């Protein structure tokens, strides 16, 4: 109760005293200000020039309590805007926090982990600077135990979180060797039984797979895909979300990389994902499906075998517009790479009507996408001499009325494609 709601000037008075105990008390008072529920006075603390004092306090092995209070204070300053985080880094906090990772006091070590997480979390530059200062080794050493279950819950969550921030951000992506250094521990965390650890582990993996094929490969070669697929079926949404994010990222890679996702049994989870009550899950799942239908004919076939086409018809028929649009993409990709048989199967499942209904949308891109798909479907119909059966099917659901109208469209590509369709299959 004695260090509650001090003014900044009193905090300064105590910290500038030559009395370690007075300094400890003032530092704690600063910590409590910075820990309050509402509007922590971060800038006032910075302007008082307190950061260098806090950083020096980090080095006081002789007085662990002031180490902890200043660590906590600096953590909260670093949790703010980029400028506020910069002030902490500018004060030399990075190497000081890294030295603290080795502290015999778990709560102090944990605090340093947290602070480094905030710093790395600011962006690529601070992320890489934290790495250059040598944070990874001591961080990983804290997790070098026979069984993660012996570690304190909060402690393990903080470590996992800070690691995921080290895996986060692009332009540039994290250093290749740093990723390689981290991955094995990350794979181990991905098998832990704590929901929070699992969520953050998945987020890390999703960050690492958000890039070119080579980055995806680094992850896939670690054999995590089956575990990701398992996590994809979890009951917890905060686990399913990053798990699905990662799987989606992986299938943006090569067909061989996509095949690993299929082989691991991912497609069997999609009936649920494509009807998931969470809008974002349906969108992400449909987007993922579109990149799978952009693959090989044998990969399209597995989509067929898993009974996923009716589910695509479903989302095309009714879903959030953004989702419907991913569905349109999935269809064009499907029709562009599929065999004749696969394409006819698509029409038999009822793709045509919900496709036509989306033509009335005021989004220029999806219209192009849908028009292209129709052209693809017609092409398959020509090889069957059933172009007329398609034209009527389109006519009867009011598709012709929409396409005819599209001959008068702002976009050039639109009316040209529609005009073409008219004088080729109608007229």
């Amino acid at each position: 109760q004695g260090t509650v709601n001090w003014s900044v000037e009193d905090i300064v008075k105590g910290i500038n005293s030559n009395n370690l105990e007075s300094q400890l008390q003032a530092t704690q008072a600063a910590r409590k200000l910075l820990s309050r529920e509402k509007q922590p006075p971060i800038d006032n603390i910075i302007r008082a020039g307190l950061i260098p004092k806090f950083v020096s306090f980090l080095g006081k092995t002789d007085c662990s309590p002031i180490q902890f209070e200043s660590a906590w204070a600096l953590t909260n300053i670093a949790s703010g805007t980029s400028e506020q985080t910069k002030a902490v880094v500018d004060g030399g906090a990075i190497p000081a926090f890294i030295s603290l990772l080795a502290s015999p006091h778990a709560h102090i070590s944990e605090q340093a982990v947290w602070a480094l997480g905030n710093i790395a979390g600011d962006g690529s530059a601070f992320r890489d600077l934290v790495i250059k200062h040598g944070a990874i080794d001591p961080l990983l050493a804290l997790l070098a135990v026979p069984d993660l279950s012996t570690l304190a819950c909060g402690y393990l969550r903080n470590l996992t979180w800070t690691l995921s921030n080290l895996c986060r951000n692009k332009n540039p992506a994290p250093p290749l060797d740093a990723v390689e250094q981290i991955l094995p521990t990350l794979v181990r965390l991905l098998h832990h039984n704590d929901p929070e650890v699992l969520a953050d582990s998945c987020w890390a993996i999703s960050y690492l797979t958000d890039g070119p094929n080579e980055r995806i490969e680094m992850v896939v070669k670690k054999g995590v895909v089956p575990q990701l697929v398992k996590l994809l079926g979890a009951t917890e949404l905060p686990i399913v979300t990053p798990a699905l994010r990662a799987i989606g990222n992986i299938v943006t890679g090569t067909d061989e990389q996509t095949q690993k996702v299929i082989d691991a049994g991912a497609l069997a989870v999609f009936p649920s994902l494509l009807t998931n009550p969470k809008t974002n899950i349906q969108k992400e799942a449909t987007w993922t499906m579109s990149n799978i239908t952009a693959g090989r004919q044998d990969q399209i076939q597995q989509v067929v075998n898993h009974g996923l086409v009716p589910f695509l018809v479903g989302v095309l028929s009714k879903a959030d517009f953004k989702t419907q649009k991913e569905a349109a993409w999935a269809i064009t990709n499907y029709t562009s790479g599929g065999t004749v048989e696969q394409i006819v199967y698509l029409v038999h499942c009822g793709i045509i009507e919900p496709l036509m209904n989306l033509l009335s949308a005021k989004d220029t891109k999806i219209i192009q996408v849908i028009l292209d798909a129709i052209s693809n479907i017609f092409q398959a119909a020509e090889k069957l001499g059933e172009t007329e059966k398609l034209s009527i099917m389109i006519e009867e659901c009011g598709g012709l009325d929409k396409i005819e109208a599209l001959q008068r469209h702002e976009n050039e590509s639109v009316y040209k494609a529609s005009l073409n369709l008219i004088e080729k299959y109608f007229s």
Partner: peptide
Amino acid sequence: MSRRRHSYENDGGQPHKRRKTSD
């Protein structure tokens, strides 16, 4: 063909930083 993450979208919306308000 395959479509990667749009450059104008975030990486999932997870908080980048965390303020400690309790012990």
